[PDB]
Write an enzyme that holds these catalytic residues in place. Structure first.
Site, PDB file in Angstrom:
ATOM      1  N   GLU A 160       1.256   1.308   3.920  1.00 48.29           N
ATOM      2  CA  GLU A 160       1.853   1.530   2.821  1.00 48.29           C
ATOM      3  C   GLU A 160       3.874   1.419   3.564  1.00 48.29           C
ATOM      4  O   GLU A 160       4.598   1.857   2.711  1.00 48.29           O
ATOM      5  CB  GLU A 160       2.221   3.615   3.941  1.00 48.29           C
ATOM      6  CG  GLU A 160       0.962   4.650   3.126  1.00 48.29           C
ATOM      7  CD  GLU A 160       0.997   4.630   0.916  1.00 48.29           C
ATOM      8  OE1 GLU A 160       2.195   4.383   0.697  1.00 48.29           O
ATOM      9  OE2 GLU A 160      -0.120   5.047   1.574  1.00 48.29           O
TER      10      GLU A 160
ATOM     11  N   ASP B 123       7.883   3.785  -5.312  1.00 46.70           N
ATOM     12  CA  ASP B 123       5.841   3.769  -4.803  1.00 46.70           C
ATOM     13  C   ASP B 123       5.536   2.394  -5.716  1.00 46.70           C
ATOM     14  O   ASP B 123       6.074   2.777  -7.023  1.00 46.70           O
ATOM     15  CB  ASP B 123       5.432   4.584  -4.531  1.00 46.70           C
ATOM     16  CG  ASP B 123       4.615   5.868  -5.811  1.00 46.70           C
ATOM     17  OD1 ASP B 123       5.020   5.076  -6.633  1.00 46.70           O
ATOM     18  OD2 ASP B 123       4.119   6.483  -5.188  1.00 46.70           O
TER      19      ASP B 123
END
Ligand SMILES: CCO[C@@H]1CCC=CO1
Length: 162
Positions: free
Chosen positions: A11, A20
């Protein structure tokens, strides 16, 4: 290696609101804020999450706090999910981390789509499960990450994260 180290690799860590892989406002260690295209909506969600007016920026400690909460929530969600719990409980600890990782990334809405993969995992048909897992939007959209998670499911080792 453990679930925190694994998800930290997958991440990243960013202290300012960013988009994202799906284009959604996120912060910290993959903390999704909102699917809204409105940055103000994302800022509101951030302030609510942290409990102060952040104006789109947080500290490392704050990011790690959200991360702790998000990992906890992901695991607990698995246990509360009637489809996922028996599969999760059947797995060894390393493969459990792969399941937490996937849930962290994807959430639970697409669980029914992974019915066949889940069955193969519960049956411990690891190579077959790995083949099936790759036949997915998930794999096609994030193939390098999915390859690491799939290798973890296939082998029950941390080889993909070394
Ligand atoms: C994302 C939740 O669905 C499952 C859980 C882990 C293995 C396959 O997908």
């Amino acid at each position: 290696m453990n679930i925190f180290e694994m998800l930290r690799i997958d991440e990243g860590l960013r202290l300012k609101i960013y988009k994202d892989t799906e284009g959604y406002y996120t912060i910290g260690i993959g903390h999704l804020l909102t699917k809204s295209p409105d940055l103000n909506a994302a800022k509101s969600e951030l302030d609510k999450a942290i409990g102060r007016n952040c104006n789109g920026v947080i500290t490392k400690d704050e990011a790690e706090k959200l991360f702790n909460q998000d990992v906890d929530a992901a695991v607990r969600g698995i246990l509360r999910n009637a489809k996922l719990k028996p599969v999760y409980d059947s797995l060894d600890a390393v493969r459990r981390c792969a399941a937490i990782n996937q849930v962290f990334q994807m959430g639970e809405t697409g669980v029914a789509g992974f019915t066949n993969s889940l069955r193969m995992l519960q049956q411990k048909r690891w190579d077959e499960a790995a083949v099936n897992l790759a036949k997915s939007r998930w794999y096609n959209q994030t193939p390098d990450r999915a390859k690491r998670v799939i290798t973890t499911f296939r082998t029950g080792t941390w080889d993909a994260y070394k």
